[PDB]
């Protein structure tokens, strides 16, 4: 009888930076996808390995809701087999991804006149992220032969950068709130079912 708490994910006041993306496990609830259907603000709403129409007629062991904020032209990196600074260093989906990606423009919430410097992304990393891996380290990146010893300098760079979202940016550079729903079928029983399989 319990409904899945999609509202507290999609309609949260504050969203995580992509490098420190937020994950909420959704279990033991009825997945009413109608609220997701009827939100006419979604620029992106697509699924992989499953049709978004058949979500109310399916059951899963767990549904993982990952959320973060990136630029508009970076939303496409939140997809199987994609590359770029966000997919390589911040949030990586697997090539076998089963789930849905939802993104909507959030210029009205996450932009500030003079810049909102609270949203960050990782720019440097010695290796790409594994799927669903998170790196929240703040260690100086050694871009040259000389070791850094934690001191920023020549070929020694801080790994995070700030978006600095302003409302006057073009839509490509404007902030977009992203929610990735992952569909897991590992250890029975299934706990998240649509109202049509319930």
């Amino acid at each position, epitope marked *: 009888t319990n409904l899945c708490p999609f509202g507290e994910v999609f309609n949260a006041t504050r969203f995580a930076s992509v490098y420190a993306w937020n994950r909420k496990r959704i279990s033991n609830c009825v997945a009413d996808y109608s609220v997701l259907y009827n939100s006419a603000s*979604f620029s992106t709403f*697509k*699924c992989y390995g499953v049709s978004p*129409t058949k979500l109310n007629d399916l059951c899963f062991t767990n549904v993982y809701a990952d959320s973060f904020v990136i630029r508009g*032209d970076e939303v*496409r990196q939140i997809a199987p*087999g*994609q590359t770029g600074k966000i997919a390589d260093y911040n949030y990586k989906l697997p090539d076998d991804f089963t789930g849905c990606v939802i*993104a909507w423009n959030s210029n009205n919430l996450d932009s500030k006149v003079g810049g909102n410097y609270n949203y960050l992304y990782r720019l440097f990393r010695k290796s790409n992220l594994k799927p669903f891996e998170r790196d929240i380290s703040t260690e100086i990146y050694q871009a040259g032969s000389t070791p850094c010893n934690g001191v920023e300098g020549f070929n020694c760079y801080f790994p995070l950068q700030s978006y600095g979202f302003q409302p006057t940016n073009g839509v490509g550079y404007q902030p977009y709130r992203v929610v990735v729903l992952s569909f897991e079928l590992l250890h029975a029983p299934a706990t998240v079912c649509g109202p049509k399989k319930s």
Partner: nanobody
Amino acid sequence: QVQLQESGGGLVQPGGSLRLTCAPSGFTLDYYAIGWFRQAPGKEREGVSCISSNNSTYYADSVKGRFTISRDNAKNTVYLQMNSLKPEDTAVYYCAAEPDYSGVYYYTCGWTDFGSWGQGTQVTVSS
């Protein structure tokens, strides 16, 4: 990024039909998803119709009964048949492409789903 060229635009009477064509250059549309977008004078860019690499489709509500998107990977071409054209359909129509190695299934289709864009072709429906 990839090179995209549109064709089939023009001026047509209301109720008439047009067939937009998106031709890739320098690659094949096999792994790619293709979408059609339009921007009317004095308005924002809107998604019209999209097709996945698995041939699943998206249609905006305003074109649902009138437009049909199709894929021909052998001829390396995506078509947008546009029947029963109305004056509100007057806009510049853009083709868009995005790698889609797995099969994507759309509920909506927006500009945030594509990285490559064509120059566009003009569609005008006036009597």
